[PDB]
């Protein structure tokens, strides 16, 4: 148990990655190739002394991973297990940005990609960009936004991994800053056991702007997934998360694993699991134990 494990994904051929690697980087150093049948994953798992990990081993290999361009896990421990994970829904859950393609749709991606604009420079709030860009939407035929969200796409990788997740003991949410609509109709479609986000009501089927407060911006998504594994009794070093942008570090910092998706700059610098080059059927390496 003074003992650590770092699984290693790549798609160079692994003799070739484990020799690199070794003279790259020099006590035992256990090397195992394996093959995760369940993913269709062929995967190098090195064990080496737990004194190894520190912050400076860290930023090295994950310096050197995004140089030769490998994914790479270090075994939680204890494992997380029977417990939650949620995922953001935009460029998380799914590929795209659900209010965006909404204003794509509608010829608008100009004024709603300038609200960004101000919100991003810091010139203005995020609640407020949330709220300006949904006014622009007013109107919209709940239709549309069916439409909108039946073109979105899964993440890579969800669609094998997710009956997994089940199948492991776990609840799956999404937690989002996003639509309800979208919500829970990804919820639905995808049998996830819990789904949150902002509320903005439709009606006499057109998008109102009757927005439910207070709005769920970051703070609250962490508060969000803290009520939820109360209710559940789930302990902290249970609950997975995975995200990709600034709004999702508390709720990723907060989670025991945290998990940052192809993600934005400063989220791969405070979150360092990391999924950067392959598809969610690598959540398998921080949920089952026999790899
Ligand atoms: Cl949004
Ligand atoms: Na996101």
Same mark, same amino acid.
């Given at each position: 148990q003074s003992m650590s494990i770092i699984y290693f994904i790549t798609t160079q051929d692994i003799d070739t990655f484990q020799k690199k690697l070794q003279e790259t980087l020099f006590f035992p150093l256990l090397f195992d190739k394996r093959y995760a049948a369940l993913i269709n994953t062929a995967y190098l798992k090195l064990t080496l002394?737990?004194?190894? &990990?520190t912050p400076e081993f860290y930023r090295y290999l994950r310096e050197l991973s995004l140089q030769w361009q490998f994914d790479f896990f270090i075994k939680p421990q204890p494992l997380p297990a029977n417990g939650i994970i949620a995922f953001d829904m935009?460029?998380?859950?799914?590929?795209?940005?659900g209010v965006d393609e909404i204003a794509r749709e509608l010829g608008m991606s100009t004024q709603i990609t300038a609200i960004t604009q101000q919100a991003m420079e810091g010139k203005l709030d995020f609640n407020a960009s949330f709220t300006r860009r949904i006014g622009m939407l007013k109107g919209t035929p709940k239709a549309v936004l069916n439409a909108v969200c039946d073109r979105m796409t899964l993440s890579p990788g969800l669609l094998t991994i997710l009956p997994v997740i089940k199948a492991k003991g776990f609840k799956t949410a999404i937690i989002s800053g996003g639509l309800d609509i979208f919500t829970q109709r990804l919820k639905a479609r995808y049998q996830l056991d819990y789904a949150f986000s902002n509320t903005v009501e439709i009606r006499d089927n057109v998008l109102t702007d009757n927005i439910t407060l207070p709005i769920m911006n970051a703070a609250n998504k962490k508060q969000t997934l803290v009520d939820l594994a109360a209710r559940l009794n789930i302990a902290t070093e249970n609950i997975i998360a995975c995200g990709d942008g600034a709004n999702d570090l508390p709720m990723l910092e907060h989670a025991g694993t945290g998990i940052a998706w192809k993600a934005k700059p400063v989220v791969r610098e405070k979150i360092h699991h990391q999924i950067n080059?392959?598809?969610?059927?690598? &959540?398998l390496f921080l949920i089952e134990d026999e790899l």
């Open positions: 002394p737990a004194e190894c &990990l935009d460029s998380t859950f799914i590929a795209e940005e080059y392959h598809g969610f059927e690598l &959540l």
